[PDB]
């Protein structure tokens, strides 16, 4: 009986080591491991015969639905096409933005002006909107 338990503990110890070298030593993008709320820093403390982990996590709430587009383009020049970086392009519902479209973060509802910092140039696609007036990235 003792030999069996010792082997299971050794395997469990390997799992703990992996979590120290993943869940604790770094933020992780994997989901799965760590507490289920994306991942943000986790901590570990001593427990009898083992380690006790605590995981801080992020829980989304109050979801709303919005209109969004796959990307935007220049209607005057089809090779000028953009798509958001780490976020989305949505129709604006905010009174401070004169532009019909706005950038948002993907973790939270937070519309903002579209600027070169939050977008990248991409190959053209048939689903991108054709913008015939005011786009600052590219200005032309």
């Amino acid at each position, epitope marked *: 009986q003792q030999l069996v338990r010792s082997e299971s503990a050794a395997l469990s110890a390997q799992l703990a080591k992996d979590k120290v070298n993943e869940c604790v030593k770094a933020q992780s993008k994997r989901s799965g491991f760590c507490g289920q709320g994306t991942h943000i820093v986790s901590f570990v403390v001593n427990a009898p015969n083992g380690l006790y982990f605590m995981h801080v996590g992020y829980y989304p709430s109050n979801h709303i639905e919005v*209109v969004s587009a796959y990307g935007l383009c220049d209607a005057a020049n089809p090779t000028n096409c953009i798509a958001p970086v780490n976020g989305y392009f949505i129709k604006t519902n905010n*009174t*401070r*933005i*004169v532009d019909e479209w706005s950038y948002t973060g993907s973790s939270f509802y937070a519309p903002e*002006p579209i600027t070169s910092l939050n977008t990248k140039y991409v190959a053209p696609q048939v689903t991108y909107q054709n913008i015939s*007036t005011n786009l600052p990235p590219p200005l032309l």
Partner: antibody, heavy 119, light 111 residues
Framework: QVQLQQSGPELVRPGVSVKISCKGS????????IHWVKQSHAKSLEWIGV????????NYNQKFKGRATMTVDKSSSTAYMELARLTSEDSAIYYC???????????????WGQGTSVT | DIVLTQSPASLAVSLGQRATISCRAS??????????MNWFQQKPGQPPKLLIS???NQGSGVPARFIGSGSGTDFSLNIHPVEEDDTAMYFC?????????FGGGTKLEIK
């Protein structure tokens, strides 16, 4: 208790620029965009342009893109518009208006200024 | 922009009479079914004001007496109880695209 306080009327000479302003009241001024409208006749009105008061971003009616500009003075909670090269055909009742969303994704003109005029 | 027209150019009615306004667009104003149609009102000595929006026939300016209707290129405004203080100019507004132009309007007055 929202109000827009338009500046008083003036008989500006042709060939001279003219400036018009509205002071916001009863709300935080920086959370909205100002819309400007021209009333060329009692039977007709047209949009002039829009100015964000938070970012300073603008759009204009194409006919006024080389004729006018807009500025803000957030410490005074006011906004301005100025138009170059006035002519007698531009006499109008001018109105400021505040952006709103009574319906999702639909701009509404919401509150209106009492009207001012230039001739 | 999309051209807007309205009819009848003016209407005169008896007190408490039903009345309507027809408004046509040269091209549909729906984008993703949003519609973007706003109706406005004006009287002499005052600025024009919002009445209704295409998904709000009460509030957003006035009471449920002013019912907006239609989709695509056709819109209308229906008031079952027209009264003397409803004497006004009325205007269709397009919020769908810049320049954000709007119709020449119609006039309503009690006979």
């Amino acid at each position: 208790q929202v109000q827009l306080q338009q500046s008083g009327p003036e008989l500006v000479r042709p060939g001279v620029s003219v400036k018009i302003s509205c002071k916001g009241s009863g709300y935080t001024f920086t959370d909205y965009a100002i819309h400007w409208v021209k009333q060329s006749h009692a039977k007709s009105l047209e949009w002039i342009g829009v100015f964000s008061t938070y970012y300073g971003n603008t759009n204009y009616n194409q006919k006024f893109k080389g004729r006018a500009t807009m500025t803000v003075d957030k410490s005074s909670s006011t906004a301005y518009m100025e138009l170059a090269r006035l002519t007698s055909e531009d006499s109008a009742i001018y109105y400021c208006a505040r952006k709103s969303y009574y319906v999702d994704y639909v701009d509404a003109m919401d509150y209106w200024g009492q009207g001012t005029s230039v001739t | 922009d999309i051209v807007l027209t309205q009819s009848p150019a003016s209407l005169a009615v008896s007190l408490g009479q039903r009345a309507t306004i027809s408004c046509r667009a040269s091209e549909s104003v729906d984008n993703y079914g949003i519609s973007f149609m706003n109706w406005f009102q004006q009287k002499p000595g005052q600025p024009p004001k919002l009445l209704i929006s295409a998904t709000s026939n009460q509030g957003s300016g006035v009471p449920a007496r002013f019912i907006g209707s239609g989709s695509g290129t056709d819109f209308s405004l229906n008031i079952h109880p027209v009264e003397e203080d409803d004497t006004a100019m009325y205007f269709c507004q397009q919020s769908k695209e810049v320049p954000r132009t709007f119709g020449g309007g119609t006039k309503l007055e009690i006979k």
